C-alpha cells in the first residue's frame, strides 16, 4: 500500500518537474541582459537606532514608513521614530526569547513571538498610554519564527511545529491551520492583496498559501538548505527567498518555478533576511557575513553592499514608500540605509 | 504646531531611555543559562541572579531555536545508545557557528563496550574522585563518558569556550552551576584582556 502510494507521489513529482520544464523558456538571466544595470548603489546609514540590549531578531515598518518596530532578546519591543531616532515605545515582553514581530499596518497593534509558542499582540493605541498585551495567541506547538498582520483582527504566524496559522485575534483562535512542510516554518510574506501569502521553511522549500483556506496553492523548490526569509516582489507575482545555502532565489507564481539565483562565489554565508525595494528592482538580503547585499533583482548583479554591522544581520525590511532600508543585527542596533 | 509634537516626543524618549537604563542593570546582571535535557527557571546563588531555560516545548529539531541562545553564558547539558546521541548533540553545539563562544556545563547523571568498544581499553586517567566504597567499574565508566565529552570540547574553540563536566541533590548541583559560571565569566574576561 505504502510503496504503491510513494511511487505515485514520485510520479506526480516528476510530472510537476516536467510541467515546470515545459515552461522553462528564456528566463531573466537571458531576458534582462539588454537592460541597463542598476549600477553600484551605495547607501549610507542615515540613522542609527541605539537602545536594544540584546540581539535584534526582527523588525517591521508600519505603512507610514516612519514608525519602526524591532524585537530583541532583552525583553523589549522598541518602536522607533525612524526619522528622529526617538523611541516611542519600549514594550516589555512576557518572555525575552522573541524571534519575530510585526506591526499592524494601521499602527494600532504590534505583534511578537518566539519560544513561548505564543504570538503576543499588544494594543499600541490605548487610552491609558500603557501598551499592554491584548491577546496571547497561544496554540502553536513550537516557536514562532514569523508573524505578519493582515488586518487589526487577523494575523498569520509561522512556527517550529511546521505549520502556519491564520488567527482571529479577537477570539484568540486559529481559524485556518496551514499544514504541510516537514521542518520548521521560518518566514512569512503576505502578498500585497492579503489573499495570498508565502511561507518559507526548513525543508528548502516555500509554499504559496491561500490565506482563506488551509490550502497550499504552489510548492516552490530549488533551495538546498533551510529557508530563513521570504519577501514578495511588489506586484504579488513573485518572491525572493533567502536560505542557508547563501543563494537568494527569485520565484514566480505564475511560472511556478525559480527564475533567478542571487549568489556569488565569495559568499558562503547564509541569508537571514530578505526584502524588496518598492520597484522590485533591488533585492536586499542580509547575511551571516555581517552585511547586506543589494542585488539587482532582474540581473543578479551584486551592485552595492550595506555593511555597518559586526554581528549577524537579520531583521531586514523596507519602507512602504520605498524610501529606506532598515537592518538589524545581533549587535543590537538598527541601521537605516539610503 | 509640530514643535510641540517634537518636544513631547523628546520627553517620551527620555522616559524610555531612563527606564531602559534601569532595565539594563538587571539584564546585564542576570545570567542566562540554556538547558538541554519554554520553561523559565529563576534562581539566585550568593546574590547572583540567574535564570535557566528548559526548552522542552520545541520538538526534536534544534537547528533554529538553539541559534537564538547566542548570548547565553552557559548551556547546561544533561546526559542520562542515548550517550551517542548526547555526544552528537554536544558536538554539534560545540561546533555551532553561533554557539561557538558558549561554554557548556555538563551534568552526567545515573554494557558500555557494546556502544563504545574503546571503553574496554580505557584506563581511569589517574585523576579521579571516586566515592569511598564506589564500584571501580562505575568509576571507570563515569570517567570514560566524561572524557568522551571532553575529547569533543578540547578538539576546537581555541579557548573561546570550555566544558565543565560534573557528575550527578539540587543544592549541590546549582552550587556547581554558579561556580562553573564564575569560571566561565573569568575566562571570558581573561581572554578579552589577552591574559588566557
Amino acid at each position, epitope marked *: 500500500e505504502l510503496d504503491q502510494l510513494r511511487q505515485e507521489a514520485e510520479q506526480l*513529482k516528476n510530472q510537476i518537474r516536467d510541467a515546470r520544464k515545459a515552461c522553462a523558456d528564456a528566463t531573466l538571466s537571458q531576458i534582462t541582459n539588454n537592460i541597463d544595470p542598476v549600477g553600484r548603489i551605495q547607501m549610507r546609514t542615515r540613522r542609527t537606532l541605539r537602545g536594544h540590549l540584546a540581539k535584534i531578531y526582527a523588525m517591521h515598518w508600519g505603512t507610514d514608513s516612519r514608525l519602526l518596530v524591532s524585537a530583541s532578546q532583552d525583553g523589549k519591543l522598541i518602536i522607533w521614530d525612524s526619522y528622529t531616532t526617538n523611541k516611542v515605545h519600549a514594550i516589555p515582553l512576557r518572555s525575552s526569547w522573541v524571534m519575530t514581530c510585526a506591526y499592524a499596518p494601521s499602527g494600532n497593534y504590534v505583534a511578537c513571538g518566539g519560544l513561548d509558542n505564543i504570538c503576543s499582540i499588544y494594543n499600541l493605541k490605548t487610552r491609558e498610554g500603557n501598551v499592554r498585551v491584548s491577546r496571547e495567541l497561544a496554540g502553536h506547538t513550537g516557536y514562532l519564527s514569523c508573524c505578519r498582520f493582515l488586518d487589526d483582527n487577523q494575523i498569520v504566524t509561522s512556527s517550529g511545529d511546521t505549520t502556519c496559522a491564520l488567527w482571529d485575534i479577537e477570539t484568540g483562535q486559529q481559524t485556518t491551520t496551514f499544514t504541510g512542510h*516537514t521542518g520548521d516554518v521560518m518566514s512569512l510574506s503576505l502578498a500585497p492583496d492579503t489573499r495570498l501569502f508565502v511561507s518559507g521553511a526548513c525543508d528548502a522549500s516555500a509554499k504559496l498559501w491561500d490565506v482563506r483556506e488551509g490550502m497550499c496553492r504552489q510548492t516552490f523548490t530549488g533551495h538546498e*538548505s533551510d529557508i530563513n526569509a521570504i519577501c514578495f516582489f511588489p506586484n504579488g507575482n513573485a518572491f525572493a527567498t533567502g536560505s542557508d545555502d547563501a543563494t537568494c532565489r527569485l520565484f514566480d507564481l505564475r511560472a511556478d518555478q525559480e527564475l533567478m539565483t542571487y549568489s556569488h562565489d565569495n559568499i*558562503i554565508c547564509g541569508i537571514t533576511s530578505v526584502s524588496f525595494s518598492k520597484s522590485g528592482r533591488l533585492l536586499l538580503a542580509g547575511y551571516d557575513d555581517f552585511n547586506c547585499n543589494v542585488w539587482d533583482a532582474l540581473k543578479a548583479d551584486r551592485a552595492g553592499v550595506l555593511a555597518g554591522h559586526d554581528n549577524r544581520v537579520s531583521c531586514l525590511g523596507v519602507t512602504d514608500d520605498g524610501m529606506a532600508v532598515a537592518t538589524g543585527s545581533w549587535d543590537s542596533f538598527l541601521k537605516i540605509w539610503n | 504646531d509640530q514643535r510641540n509634537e517634537e518636544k513631547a516626543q523628546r520627553e517620551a524618549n527620555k522616559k524610555i531611555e531612563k527606564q531602559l537604563q534601569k532595565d539594563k542593570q538587571v539584564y546585564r546582571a542576570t545570567h542566562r543559562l540554556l538547558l538541554l535535557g519554554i520553561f523559565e527557571t529563576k534562581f539566585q546563588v550568593d546574590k547572583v541572579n540567574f535564570h535557566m531555560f528548559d526548552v522542552g516545548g520545541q520538538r526534536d529539531e534544534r*537547528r533554529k531555536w538553539i541559534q537564538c541562545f547566542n548570548d547565553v553564558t552557559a548551556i547546561i547539558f544533561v546526559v542520562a*545508545n542515548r550517550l551517542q546521541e548526547a555526544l552528537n548533540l554536544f558536538k554539534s553545539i560545540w561546533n555551532n*557557528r553561533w554557539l561557538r563562544t558558549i561554554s557548556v556545563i555538563l551534568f552526567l547523571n545515573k554494557k558500555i563496550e557494546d556502544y563504545f568498544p574503546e571503553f574496554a581499553r580505557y584506563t581511569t586517567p589517574e585523576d579521579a574522585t571516586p566515592e569511598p566504597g564506589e564500584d571501580p567499574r562505575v568509576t571507570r565508566a563515569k570517567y570514560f563518558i566524561r572524557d568522551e565529552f571532553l575529547r569533543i570540547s578540547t578538539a576546537s574553540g581555541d579557548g573561546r569556550h570550555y566544558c565543565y563536566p560534573h557528575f550527578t541533590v539540587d543544592t549541590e548541583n546549582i552550587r556547581r552551576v554558579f561556580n562553573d559560571c564564575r569560571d566561565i565569566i573569568q575566562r571570558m574576561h581573561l581572554r578579552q584582556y589577552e591574559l588566557l
Partner: nanobody
Amino acid sequence: QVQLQESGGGLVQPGGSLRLSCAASGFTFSNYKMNWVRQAPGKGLEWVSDISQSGASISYTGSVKGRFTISRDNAKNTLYLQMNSLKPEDTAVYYCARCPAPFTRDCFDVTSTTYAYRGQGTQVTV
C-alpha cells in the same frame, strides 16, 4: 529540490556484508557534510556515521567502529556505507542524511524524526 535516495539494502546472512549507497541530487553535495542514520525496529533514530565535506575526517557510532565504514565520491554526488561482519543487532532502516547547511561543522537534527534532508532509507536485515 533536495533528494537523497538510498539503495543496496536487503537481507544479509549474519557475518556477511552489504554495500549501501546514497544517490544525492539537487544540492551541491561537495559542500555538505553527510551522515548515515539508523532505525532499528522498535527504536528511534541513531546516528551511525559522519563524513566531512571533503571526505576527510570520519566519525562513527562506537558500536559500529571497525565494522562499518564510509566514504563519499563527490564527483558522483554519492555517499556510501560499507557494512562488514553484520550482526542481527544491525537490523535497521538505514537512512542517508545531510547536515543542514553547506560549509559547516555542525549537524543539527540529523536523526530528528522529521528531519527534512533525509532519504527514505533502505531496510537492512541480518
